[PDB]
UniProtKB/TrEMBL annotation, chain A:
Domain Large ribosomal subunit protein uL5 C-terminal: 83-176
Alphabetical GO biological process terms: translation
Taxonomic lineage: Bacteria, Pseudomonadati, Pseudomonadota, Gammaproteobacteria, Enterobacterales
NCBIfam families: PRK00010.1
Record's protein name: Large ribosomal subunit protein uL5
Length: 177, 314, 136, 85, 50
RNA sequence: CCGACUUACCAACCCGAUGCAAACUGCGAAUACCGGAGAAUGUUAUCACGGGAGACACACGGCGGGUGCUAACGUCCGUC
RNA sequence: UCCUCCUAAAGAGUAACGGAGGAGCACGAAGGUUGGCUAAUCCUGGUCGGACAUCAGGAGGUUAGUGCAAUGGCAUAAGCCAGCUUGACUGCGAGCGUGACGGCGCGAGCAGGUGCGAAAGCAGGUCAUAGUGAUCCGGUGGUUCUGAAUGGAAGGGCCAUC
RNA sequence: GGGUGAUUAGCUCAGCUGGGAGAGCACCUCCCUAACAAGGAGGGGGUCGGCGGUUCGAUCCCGUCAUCACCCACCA
């Protein structure tokens, strides 16, 4: 891809010497991106979930799978099976295309952006991020949207540590703090 | 059966319903008295008695209450409306060689109910098409204020899935219904339209014509627009639901445009008359039907005979 | 007065109290009151012997109650015929078989725990003996 | 002396008829095809060779021979087979 | 007790019917199954009747 | 707001010890029951069919229990 | 009246005005098959979003689930999803179990037709055990079986059903 | 000793096999009045007896206990 070979040269050469790995199979690689958006308010009407799915499919070149509530919670006034969020899994070429077109022309568009948290690693090397505003992607033209529905990114990688995930993700110029 | 006219039949009907209500009240009285008797002890080794028990058990029966619609037709309040609501300038529309609207201009002040009247196919529904934006006028210049939110009710009910139940068709399956600002329970909202029991389970196709009109209004008033475009809203409705709708229309903060052929229903609510005439002229008159007739009498023409009553046979 | 909170079943079969006990050793403190005899120990008698022991050693020392009632004893109303269901629970007993260590003390001298147990055993309906800890 | 007698009531007192479950033909017994072996509720015993399972999970002989009981399998379940003897 | 009793009448032209129950509220559409008809000895369509 | 500090603590969660259960079981008898073989013994004691019945108020004692007050020459079952 | 557990004494059964609960239905899919799948709960990071919504990975290992009581069972799932469907077939039925009988239940296999599967195969309702009412009398449809001199018919019978 | 009913705002009471939960007068403010009453305008209130339970909802449905109100305690 545009960034696939970039990774396969620079990041592999860096992480082969950084951690004294004996094999190229040992250096961690990113395996998928999960774009989540739990609408929550679609209990009021399905139109909100359809709109959010439209925005998610615009943002990432894939139709979003509609996720329904797994269990009924009386606190949130939902019951089992209510369509409540949208989710996209990106792998391979689309994964890398979205990764580049994010870390290039979507993070810079974050209002009052000064860096993404570097300590926000789950402990298994995977990273997560919230945007609070979908308009930060160029695909939203402001002339067909209705709300500022936020979005969530989860970069799932094969790293086995937070240091490994940070090392892998910094080589791509991740705007950390 | 009944021999007589509508008003005499109405009187007979009120007397019948009053007698039935009185008999039901007496039944409640007697049932309470006999229940008080049943809830006493035997007092010794004496009877109590199974014949009276049997009489009370057979007295505990069921009576059919009238499923009368009456005043519950719920028109939700829309967003606050500014003074500029709707304005048309020199509106003109034609089809082929017959023209329906020609150089029509009028402005709708807020809070107004506009009785749109005229002959068949004069353009009454096409005007609603232009206002709702589904048709494009030849002479243009239809405009709405930026606060205006439009809710439209069609002349035809051919948009509801006859398979779905009443509750599913009205609410879409979501337990909570969003109406503008406030979230409303879907079952409560549906019951606001006389479907107050297990009538939520009936199918749209299995519904009757009047129930179809009621469900149509329920499904199409949920958008919460402060401008209403009702096209023949009292088609299959009876006098009770008609009165309920008239009251709901009166207690409306927004404004509405109602196309109808019921002169009495239009007269009881209309504040501006939009009446179609020949050669595609749509006379607009600000006022109700009383003052419209008075204006016609003030500047009238000398005749009274419309029809000819041609024939069928030969 | 010891009693279970939130028992599974309200009433219980009368049952039989055979066999020897299981908790037949001093396992927390240094001296214990072993139950030589057999019977049922109600919750009122559990408390009365407990109050006797605390007063005998005053504040000092720790006391363990190794027996808990957990057994509902139903009693029919007075002057009532037979049948018409089972009686209602009126008190809770603990079934006691020979060898059961009921109470045990610690932190007090043996000469004092000897007297403290003698005062409590005067409140219980079964024969007891003063028993000490062992090295197994 | 309107005090001597007293009474009450009860809320339970009903049960169901017994279903006569349990093993019908025991181990080593010779049976004909179609003979019921165990009348179960679940699958306490599972069907082995030459025996079948009904909708009630009744285990019946599908051939004629001796009943056998086994505890074979990775889940240590009791199986009932039949040897054509 | 809202499952009324219906009979599926054979479309083979003989008078033969299976009999069953149906929720007449939630299932207003008439039942229609391909069942065996012992009169003609062929699997044919049975349609709901009274 | 972030709760910033007190339990001579009510307190299930995990661990170490210690109990209890008809409607608990990661265990588990003796007996009883079912089937096969082998003798010895037993006026076939077994089964089927047919003619005739009576009986269907039981009692106490031992053992296992429900109920009752771990009462009753109480009451209700099982077995002798 | 029926179902589940205990009493009930390790085969079956076993009483009391003994101790606890449930049923008088539901489902043309929630039935049949063929593919596929595996929970509860907790921890960590994540926009409104928290005690708990959707997301990601870790523990855990069925504490979940089963249309409804309880018991037994269920990973090859009997649990969850999807495509195609009507075996929720018709005539029978070796052999059993359980009843004092009336009756009730399980059932391989045979014949005719059928669905799913590439096939082996599975399917005669549902994880099982409740969800019910003899006979008489009468109703509906079919069947020349009968048809009070004869040919019809009425009325009967037989089959299905109310 | 046994049985039945009721529990909803400060008081008296209505309340749908679900839907902020309502009415009189009481309370709050403002008008009117020299000043109060009466009258007129606006407004707020709730343990739906309590832990419990099949439920898309438990006020009305769901065993129970708490209390107050009854009823029966006959032949004996
Ligand atoms: N696409 C079209 N082409 C030609 N004529 C049309 C078209 N659409 C509508 N018309 C005709 O134009 C006229 C407009 O009638 P429209 O449906 O607007 O309502 P109306 O006649 O005013 O009222 P009502 O519905 O109450 O009879 C009718 O005569 C209709 O048949
Ligand atoms: Mg019928
Ligand atoms: Mg006896
Ligand atoms: Mg499968
Ligand atoms: Mg076949
Ligand atoms: Mg095929
Ligand atoms: Mg005939």
């Amino acid at each position: 891809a545009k960034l696939h070979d970039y990774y396969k040269d620079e990041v592999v050469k860096k992480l082969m010497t950084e951690f004294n790995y004996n094999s190229v199979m040992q250096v961690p690689r990113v395996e998928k991106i999960t774009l989540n958006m739990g609408v929550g308010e679609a209990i009021a009407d399905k139109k909100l979930l359809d709109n959010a799915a439209a925005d998610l499919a615009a943002i990432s070149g894939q139709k979003p799978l509609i996720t329904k509530a797994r269990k009924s919670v009386a606190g949130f006034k939902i019951r089992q099976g209510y369509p409540i969020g949208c989710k996209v899994t990106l792998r391979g070429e689309r994964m890398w295309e979205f990764f580049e077109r994010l870390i290039t022309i979507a993070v810079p568009r974050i209002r009052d952006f000064r860096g993404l948290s570097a300590k926000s690693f789950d402990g298994r090397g995977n990273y997560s991020m919230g945007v609070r505003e979908q308009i930060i992607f160029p695909e939203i033209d402001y002339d067909k949207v209705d709300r500022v529905r936020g979005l969530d990114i989860t970069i799932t990688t094969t790293a086995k540590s937070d240091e490994e995930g940070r090392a892998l993700l910094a080589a791509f110029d991740f705007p950390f703090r | 059966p009944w021999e007589g006219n509508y008003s005499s039949w109405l009187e007979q009907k009120d007397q019948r319903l009053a007698q039935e209500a009185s008999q039901e009240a007496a039944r409640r009285k007697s049932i309470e008295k006999e229940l008080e008797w049943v809830r006493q002890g035997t007092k010794g080794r004496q009877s109590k008695g199974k014949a009276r028990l049997a009489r009370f058990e057979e007295l505990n029966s069921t009576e059919y209450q009238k499923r009368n619609e009456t005043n519950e037709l719920f028109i939700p309040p829309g967003p606050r409306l500014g003074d500029k609501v709707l304005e048309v300038s020199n509106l003109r529309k034609s089809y082929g060689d017959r023209l329906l609207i020609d150089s029509l201009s009028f402005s709708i002040p807020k809070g107004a109910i506009v009785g749109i009247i005229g002959p068949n196919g004069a353009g009454k529904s096409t005007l609603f098409r232009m206002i709702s934006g589904q048709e494009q006028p030849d002479s243009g210049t239809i405009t709405l204020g930026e606060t205006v939110k439009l809710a439209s009710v069609d002349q035809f009910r051919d948009s509801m899935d006859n398979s779905k139940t009443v509750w599913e068709e009205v609410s879409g399956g979501l337990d909570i219904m969003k109406i503008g600002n406030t979230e409303m329970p879907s079952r409560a909202y549906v019951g606001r339209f006389n479907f107050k029991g297990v009538d939520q389970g009936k199918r749209v196709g299995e519904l009757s014509g009047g129930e179809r009109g009621r469900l149509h209004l329920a499904k199409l008033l949920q958008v919460g627009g402060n401008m209403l475009l009702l096209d023949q809203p009292t088609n299959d409705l009876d006098i009770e639901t008609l009165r309920a709708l008239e009251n709901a229309l009166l207690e409306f903060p927004g404004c509405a445009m109602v196309i109808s052929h019921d002169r009495w229903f239009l007269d009881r609510i209309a504040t501006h008359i939009l009446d179609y005439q020949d050669e595609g002229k749509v006379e607009f008159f600000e006022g109700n039907f009383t003052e419209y007739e008075e204006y016609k009498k003030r500047t009238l023409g000398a005749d009274a005979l419309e029809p000819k009553r041609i024939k069928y046979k030969r | 007065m010891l009693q279970p909170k939130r028992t599974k079943f309200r009433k219980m079969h009368k049952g039989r109290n055979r066999g020897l006990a299981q908790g037949t050793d001093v396992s927390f403190g240094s001296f214990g009151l072993k139950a030589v005899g057999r019977g049922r120990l109600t919750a009122r008698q559990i408390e009365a012997a407990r109050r006797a022991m605390t007063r005998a050693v005053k504040r000092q020392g720790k006391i363990w109650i190794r027996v808990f009632p957990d057994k509902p004893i139903t009693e029919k109303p007075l002057a009532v015929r037979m049948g018409k269901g089972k009686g209602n629970v009126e008190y809770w007993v603990a079934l006691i078989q020979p060898g059961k260590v009921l109470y045990e003390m610690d932190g007090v001298p043996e000469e004092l725990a000897r007297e403290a147990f003698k005062l409590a055993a005067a409140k219980l309906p079964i024969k007891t003996t003063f028993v000490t800890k062992t090295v197994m | 002396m309107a005090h001597k007698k007293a009474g009450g009531s009860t809320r339970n007192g009903r049960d169901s008829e017994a279903k006569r479950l349990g093993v019908k033909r025991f181990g080593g017994e010779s049976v004909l095809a179609g003979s019921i072996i165990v009348r179960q509720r679940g699958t306490k015993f599972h069907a082995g060779a030459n025996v079948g399972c009904g909708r009630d999970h009744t285990l019946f002989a599908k051939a004629d021979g001796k009943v056998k009981f086994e505890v074979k399998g990775p889940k240590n379940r009791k199986f009932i087979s039949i040897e054509a003897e | 007790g809202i499952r009324e009793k219906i009979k599926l009448v054979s479309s083979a032209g003989t008078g033969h019917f299976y009999t069953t129950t149906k929720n007449k509220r939630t299932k207003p559409e008439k039942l229609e199954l391909k069942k065996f008809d012992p009169v003609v000895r062929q699997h044919v369509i049975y349609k709901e009747a009274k």
